Design an enzyme around this catalytic site. Sequence first.
Site, PDB file in Angstrom:
ATOM      1  N   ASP A 149       0.835  -1.195   0.000  1.00 13.22           N
ATOM      2  CA  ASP A 149       0.000   0.000   0.000  1.00 13.22           C
ATOM      3  C   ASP A 149       0.870   1.246   0.000  1.00 13.22           C
ATOM      4  O   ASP A 149       0.999   1.931   1.016  1.00 13.22           O
ATOM      5  CB  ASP A 149      -0.917   0.005   1.225  1.00 13.22           C
ATOM      6  CG  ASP A 149      -2.046   1.015   1.111  1.00 13.22           C
ATOM      7  OD1 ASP A 149      -2.208   1.617   0.025  1.00 13.22           O
ATOM      8  OD2 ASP A 149      -2.779   1.197   2.109  1.00 13.22           O
ATOM      9  N   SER A 177      -5.021   8.345   6.179  1.00 17.23           N
ATOM     10  CA  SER A 177      -4.412   7.428   5.215  1.00 17.23           C
ATOM     11  C   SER A 177      -3.372   8.092   4.330  1.00 17.23           C
ATOM     12  O   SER A 177      -3.559   9.221   3.889  1.00 17.23           O
ATOM     13  CB  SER A 177      -5.486   6.812   4.317  1.00 17.23           C
ATOM     14  OG  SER A 177      -6.305   5.913   5.036  1.00 17.23           O
TER      15      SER A 177
END
Length: 240
Positions: free
Chosen positions: A93, A188
Amino acid sequence: VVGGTEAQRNSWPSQISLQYRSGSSWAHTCGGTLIRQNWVMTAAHCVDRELTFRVVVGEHNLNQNNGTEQYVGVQKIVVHPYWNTDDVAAGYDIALLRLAQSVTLNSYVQLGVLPRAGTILANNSPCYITGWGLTRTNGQLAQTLQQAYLPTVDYAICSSSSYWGSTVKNSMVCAGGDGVRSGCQGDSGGPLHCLVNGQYAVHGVTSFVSRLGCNVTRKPTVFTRVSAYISWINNVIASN
Ligand SMILES: [Ca+2]
């Protein structure tokens, strides 16, 4: 950031706000780290959708003019080749964004310091998470940049059945889990700043939290371990 405090304006100069255009206005969606004058490091899941993105550096209060902001569009998005949006638990990610223009470095805009390749931190190392994300589970975004002390939880402890178990990999860094402080939606892609050799370096990219909620006891915020991607990052910037 749940359980955090407002950070001194521009005390984390490499922190950026990743926003997308919605109609005639913009909206914050993720955090990021400025690693080059024209490159930003963030999470791959932040750029899964095909929208128009822009980066804001030198930001502090999202709703008003601080007299320190610089706005720049995103020219190229390079997501890790192994990223699988249907399996965030698989890792990978991480994404690199090439800015359309080079930002000017100054008192409010500075490059983030990256760790050496392969560096693993000892358990309970001092780190801080920063972001404009939700300040409460299912809550709302913070207007001003927030920060929270979030010490690391080593892989051994974090991957035990008492915590995240098999869901976490060695390519990740866990931090927090005290039930009070944590990252949350909107954080995030942001950094995990950790003190190493008298210097703060970005050791993580905020990736995920529990489905049950943001601040959950024994469910530390999980970050992509930047030190596992130094070679990849260097190969991309020296090629694009
Ligand atoms: Ca502002």
